Amino acid sequence: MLIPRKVKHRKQHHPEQRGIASGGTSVSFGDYGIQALEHAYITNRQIESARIAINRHIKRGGKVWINIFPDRPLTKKPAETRMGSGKGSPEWWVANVKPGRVLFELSYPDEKTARDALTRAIHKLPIKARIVTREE
Amino acid sequence: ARLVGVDLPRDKRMEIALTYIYGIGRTRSNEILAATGIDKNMRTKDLTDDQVTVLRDYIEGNLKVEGDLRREVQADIRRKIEIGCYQGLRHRRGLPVRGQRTKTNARTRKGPKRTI
Amino acid sequence: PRSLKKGPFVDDHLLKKVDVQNEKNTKQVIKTWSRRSTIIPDFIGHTFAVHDGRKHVPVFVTEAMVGHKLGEFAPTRTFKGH
Amino acid sequence: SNDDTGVAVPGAPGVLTKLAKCCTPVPGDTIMGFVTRGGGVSVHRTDCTNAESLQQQSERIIEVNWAPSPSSVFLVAIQVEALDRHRLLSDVTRVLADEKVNILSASVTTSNDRVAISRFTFEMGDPKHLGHLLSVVRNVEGVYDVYRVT
Amino acid sequence: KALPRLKQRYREEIREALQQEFNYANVMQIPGVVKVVVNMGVGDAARDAKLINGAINDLALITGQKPEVRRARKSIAQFKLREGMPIGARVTLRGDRMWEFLDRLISIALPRIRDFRGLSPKQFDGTGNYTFGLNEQSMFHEIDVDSIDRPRGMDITVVTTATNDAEGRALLRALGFPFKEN
Amino acid sequence: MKPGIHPDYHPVVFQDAATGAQFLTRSTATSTRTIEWPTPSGPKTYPLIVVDVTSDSHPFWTGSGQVEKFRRRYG
RNA sequence: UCAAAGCCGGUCUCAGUUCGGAUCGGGGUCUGCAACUCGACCCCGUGAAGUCGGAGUCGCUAGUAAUCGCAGAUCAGCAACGCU
């Protein structure tokens, strides 16, 4: 699971789920990629499960990139507690994923297995997504 | 350490004062002072300058002294022995090269003590 | 040691082994058992395998070791520590 | 030490030949020997890595031929994958059930290129018996990298 | 008039020799000795600042100037150092005192240090400004040797108008510095 | 540098003993700390201080195994 | 024609010293086929620790202890400062 070494502010406001992505809208790293079509907080678990799904659907051969790091904390109040008494402690680490943002990238020889691996990853992911290509 | 012909090596007789040099002992001092015309029963406070000059040039012409001699010693050890001769191995490991009991008393080379 | 009037001591075996190596200009290793035979300014390049107590011990002679007895290059005992 | 590896010296018998951990020169390839200053004859190969620094010491060397057939081998390893999720990491044991092996160059890393890199040791130092074990060890279906380690 | 020996020698022959060795388009591009600085960094004064006065006396009796006591810029836990304390005695030397001290140094002190196998010519900052160092003070005849209780070395730097180590080395060797050939 | 701050200087005479080399320079060794030995030099008179070795006298670079050993040993 | 300590004189003047002599570098001699491991001795140079020794402990009642040197055996040579 990805996680930052440190953050200047451990307790942060929720990232604004609005706007189309202005950066990371393209590939720039590989041949095939996952593009997002919804807003969502993508977490460590989601990222690692999708990476793993790719790395299992296809094995030694090709490369994978993760163009998002979940450096945005999300807190959780304890359970069975009242509202108030302060803000919760960080529990989840997410990355605010606006539409257009390319999340995962890979370079693999056969388009079939590459696209299928990316499909496995998307099914691990909480959002509607899309296969994209470096070419166009 | 500062001077070969230390103008005051130490205030005392010459035969014993010249031994305050890394290549001079009692007999070299005696033969030096005999080759020159300097008494040995005289202190260094009673020196002159010409005495020091004849001593310096005699020494620099005849025999070796602190820096050149010490470099000769260390170069002898390293180079002329080698990396891996016997006396060199034992110099390296800090032990008596010339044949000695290492079992009990080689402390002058081994150090004070490392009791386990 | 080894009074100059008596000259250096070199076992005749190693001598007849090395003089032919000189005069034929070949320098294959010499399997000489005796160590003790003072290195003389005749074979800087040739290699000897002197100590046969328990090991081969090759030794390539150089300029730097002439006169030294060949067994100095062939430690018999072994100590690594406790 | 002097029982199996070393009996090829032209000059005279008796050997203190040791096979330095440079290139595994035990296969019968173009090799030579450097009289290890304090430690015998380090036997090295022509395509060795630290061969130029030894040839810089050009006096302390001697001819060697080295075809002593009845002896042992230095050994060599290969790059082969694992998978790390409940299958195809125990394939290493499945394919080691048909071969015994000592550890040479193992390393586990999975936040990497697209595999749980598990570079695989081996006990195979034969010229004409390499592709055989490289087929026996190639069950994972994603066998792209197959070359040995030097 | 009464110029220093080294200085009249400089502007009589050394300038022309440097011109020949490096044909300078302009005379004002000729190398010249700007200053010499004698630092006597005594970091052992932090624990007790009584050694600084001996450093001061030594540098004064050597050069001819009261030194500047260099207060520490920074506090260092490892060196047992606070800010502001007397670590180092610096003397800047320009002009006639500079030339006189250089002549004294060259002609007296450097042959007076034990086992003087020369000074390194590589010891240039990269701008024709030399800097070497000493381990003691008795090499200067100006000090009474009996009054030397503690050895106290120094760092002597000779900064010039030269723009490279080559011209600096030429100038220094022309002045008569002992540059061993390496 | 100022008048009192600095030590005293005066042109003194560096005399070498090995060569008789003869320099004149201002030094902190002066009427305060010269060897009490004046001489005339030029149109004035200066005190001396003496030197054991100088740039002219000193043997430095301005003015200055073993098969051979074993062969003069063993012929 | 055997001593040494001793006696006389000179010098050193309380210091890690002209104490101490180890260790180490070089150059030698002698033995012996042969002194690397591994000899003794000599010369030049070096000049370590050691400032009278914690707990504790040993020998000795007179020609004794303490100190001084000498000889012998073994032995080519010596590691003998041991032993008699």
Short mmCIF file of N, CA and C (backbone and C1' of nucleotides) in Angstrom, two decimals, chain G residues 34-59:
data_model
loop_
_atom_site.label_atom_id
_atom_site.label_comp_id
_atom_site.label_asym_id
_atom_site.label_seq_id
_atom_site.Cartn_x
_atom_site.Cartn_y
_atom_site.Cartn_z
P A G 34 77.06 -24.66 6.52
"O5'" A G 34 75.54 -24.24 6.50
"C5'" A G 34 74.87 -24.07 5.27
"C4'" A G 34 73.38 -24.08 5.44
"C3'" A G 34 72.84 -23.06 6.41
"O3'" A G 34 72.65 -21.81 5.79
"C1'" A G 34 71.84 -25.18 6.81
P A G 35 72.93 -20.45 6.58
"O5'" A G 35 71.78 -20.42 7.67
"C5'" A G 35 71.57 -19.26 8.45
"C4'" A G 35 70.33 -19.38 9.29
"C3'" A G 35 69.88 -18.11 9.98
"O3'" A G 35 68.46 -18.06 9.99
"C1'" A G 35 70.28 -19.78 11.59
P C G 36 67.69 -17.68 8.63
"O5'" C G 36 66.31 -17.08 9.13
"C5'" C G 36 65.73 -15.98 8.47
"C4'" C G 36 64.24 -16.14 8.33
"C3'" C G 36 63.53 -16.84 9.47
"O3'" C G 36 63.24 -15.95 10.53
"C1'" C G 36 62.81 -17.73 7.41
P U G 37 63.41 -16.42 12.05
"O5'" U G 37 62.16 -17.37 12.28
"C5'" U G 37 60.86 -16.93 11.95
"C4'" U G 37 59.87 -18.06 11.85
"C3'" U G 37 59.88 -19.06 12.98
"O3'" U G 37 59.13 -18.61 14.10
"C1'" U G 37 59.77 -20.19 10.90
P C G 38 59.70 -18.77 15.58
"O5'" C G 38 61.24 -18.40 15.46
"C5'" C G 38 62.06 -18.39 16.62
"C4'" C G 38 63.47 -18.80 16.31
"C3'" C G 38 64.05 -18.20 15.03
"O3'" C G 38 65.43 -17.91 15.19
"C1'" C G 38 64.11 -20.54 14.90
P G G 39 65.90 -16.61 16.01
"O5'" G G 39 67.03 -17.19 16.95
"C5'" G G 39 66.77 -18.36 17.70
"C4'" G G 39 68.03 -18.93 18.29
"C3'" G G 39 69.00 -17.93 18.87
"O3'" G G 39 68.60 -17.49 20.15
"C1'" G G 39 70.17 -19.45 17.53
P A G 40 68.55 -15.93 20.49
"O5'" A G 40 70.02 -15.64 21.00
"C5'" A G 40 70.55 -16.42 22.05
"C4'" A G 40 72.04 -16.47 22.03
"C3'" A G 40 72.76 -15.14 21.99
"O3'" A G 40 72.82 -14.51 23.25
"C1'" A G 40 73.72 -16.57 20.40
P C G 41 72.76 -12.91 23.35
"O5'" C G 41 74.15 -12.47 22.74
"C5'" C G 41 75.35 -12.96 23.30
"C4'" C G 41 76.55 -12.66 22.45
"C3'" C G 41 76.70 -11.23 21.99
"O3'" C G 41 77.20 -10.38 23.00
"C1'" C G 41 77.05 -12.64 20.16
P C G 42 76.72 -8.85 23.07
"O5'" C G 42 77.52 -8.18 21.88
"C5'" C G 42 78.92 -8.35 21.81
"C4'" C G 42 79.49 -7.78 20.54
"C3'" C G 42 79.05 -6.38 20.20
"O3'" C G 42 79.68 -5.40 21.00
"C1'" C G 42 79.00 -7.71 18.26
P C G 43 78.87 -4.09 21.44
"O5'" C G 43 78.84 -3.23 20.11
"C5'" C G 43 80.06 -2.99 19.43
"C4'" C G 43 79.85 -2.34 18.10
"C3'" C G 43 78.85 -1.21 18.06
"O3'" C G 43 79.36 -0.01 18.61
"C1'" C G 43 78.49 -2.60 16.22
P C G 44 78.40 0.95 19.46
"O5'" C G 44 77.55 1.68 18.34
"C5'" C G 44 78.19 2.24 17.22
"C4'" C G 44 77.22 2.79 16.21
"C3'" C G 44 75.93 3.33 16.75
"O3'" C G 44 76.06 4.59 17.37
"C1'" C G 44 75.47 2.03 14.87
P G G 45 75.02 4.99 18.52
"O5'" G G 45 73.63 4.99 17.77
"C5'" G G 45 73.40 5.94 16.76
"C4'" G G 45 72.10 5.73 16.05
"C3'" G G 45 70.86 5.71 16.92
"O3'" G G 45 70.43 6.99 17.33
"C1'" G G 45 70.78 3.90 15.45
P U G 46 69.78 7.16 18.78
"O5'" U G 46 68.45 6.33 18.67
"C5'" U G 46 67.51 6.69 17.68
"C4'" U G 46 66.33 5.77 17.68
"C3'" U G 46 65.51 5.77 18.95
"O3'" U G 46 64.58 6.82 18.98
"C1'" U G 46 65.91 3.55 18.23
P G G 47 64.57 7.86 20.20
"O5'" G G 47 64.12 6.96 21.42
"C5'" G G 47 63.00 6.10 21.31
"C4'" G G 47 63.04 5.04 22.37
"C3'" G G 47 63.11 5.59 23.79
"O3'" G G 47 62.30 4.84 24.69
"C1'" G G 47 64.97 4.20 23.38
P A G 48 61.45 5.59 25.82
"O5'" A G 48 60.11 4.76 25.88
"C5'" A G 48 59.24 4.74 24.76
"C4'" A G 48 58.33 3.54 24.80
"C3'" A G 48 57.81 3.15 26.18
"O3'" A G 48 56.65 3.88 26.54
"C1'" A G 48 58.77 1.27 25.17
P A G 49 56.65 4.85 27.82
"O5'" A G 49 56.12 3.92 28.98
"C5'" A G 49 54.88 3.26 28.84
"C4'" A G 49 54.90 1.89 29.45
"C3'" A G 49 55.16 1.84 30.94
"O3'" A G 49 54.00 2.09 31.71
"C1'" A G 49 56.53 0.27 29.85
P G G 50 54.03 3.19 32.89
"O5'" G G 50 55.09 2.62 33.92
"C5'" G G 50 54.86 1.39 34.59
"C4'" G G 50 56.13 0.83 35.19
"C3'" G G 50 56.84 1.72 36.19
"O3'" G G 50 56.35 1.56 37.50
"C1'" G G 50 58.37 0.98 34.56
P U G 51 55.47 2.71 38.20
"O5'" U G 51 56.56 3.76 38.68
"C5'" U G 51 57.82 3.30 39.13
"C4'" U G 51 58.53 4.30 39.99
"C3'" U G 51 57.70 4.93 41.11
"O3'" U G 51 58.44 5.02 42.32
"C1'" U G 51 58.63 6.62 39.74
P C G 52 57.67 4.96 43.72
"O5'" C G 52 57.72 3.43 44.12
"C5'" C G 52 56.80 2.50 43.56
"C4'" C G 52 57.14 1.09 43.95
"C3'" C G 52 57.33 0.88 45.45
"O3'" C G 52 56.90 -0.43 45.81
"C1'" C G 52 59.31 0.31 44.32
P G G 53 55.97 -0.68 47.09
"O5'" G G 53 54.63 -1.26 46.47
"C5'" G G 53 53.82 -0.45 45.64
"C4'" G G 53 53.17 -1.24 44.53
"C3'" G G 53 52.87 -2.70 44.82
"O3'" G G 53 51.60 -2.90 45.40
"C1'" G G 53 54.13 -2.54 42.84
P G G 54 51.38 -2.85 46.99
"O5'" G G 54 49.80 -2.94 47.11
"C5'" G G 54 49.00 -2.03 46.39
"C4'" G G 54 47.55 -2.44 46.33
"C3'" G G 54 47.13 -3.63 47.17
"O3'" G G 54 46.98 -3.31 48.54
"C1'" G G 54 46.14 -3.75 45.02
P A G 55 47.51 -4.30 49.67
"O5'" A G 55 46.45 -5.47 49.68
"C5'" A G 55 45.11 -5.20 50.07
"C4'" A G 55 44.17 -6.28 49.61
"C3'" A G 55 44.42 -7.67 50.13
"O3'" A G 55 43.93 -7.87 51.45
"C1'" A G 55 44.07 -7.77 47.81
P G G 56 44.97 -8.08 52.66
"O5'" G G 56 45.83 -9.34 52.20
"C5'" G G 56 45.20 -10.60 52.05
"C4'" G G 56 45.74 -11.36 50.87
"C3'" G G 56 47.00 -12.17 51.12
"O3'" G G 56 46.77 -13.40 51.78
"C1'" G G 56 47.27 -10.93 49.16
P U G 57 47.83 -13.92 52.86
"O5'" U G 57 49.13 -14.22 52.00
"C5'" U G 57 49.05 -15.13 50.92
"C4'" U G 57 50.31 -15.15 50.10
"C3'" U G 57 51.59 -15.47 50.83
"O3'" U G 57 51.74 -16.84 51.15
"C1'" U G 57 51.96 -13.65 49.40
P C G 58 52.72 -17.28 52.34
"O5'" C G 58 54.15 -17.22 51.68
"C5'" C G 58 54.40 -17.95 50.50
"C4'" C G 58 55.79 -17.70 49.97
"C3'" C G 58 56.91 -17.95 50.95
"O3'" C G 58 57.22 -19.32 51.11
"C1'" C G 58 57.28 -15.91 49.85
P G G 59 57.85 -19.84 52.49
"O5'" G G 59 59.35 -19.35 52.41
"C5'" G G 59 60.17 -19.79 51.34
"C4'" G G 59 61.54 -19.17 51.38
"C3'" G G 59 62.24 -19.18 52.73
"O3'" G G 59 62.85 -20.42 53.03
"C1'" G G 59 62.41 -17.04 51.79
#
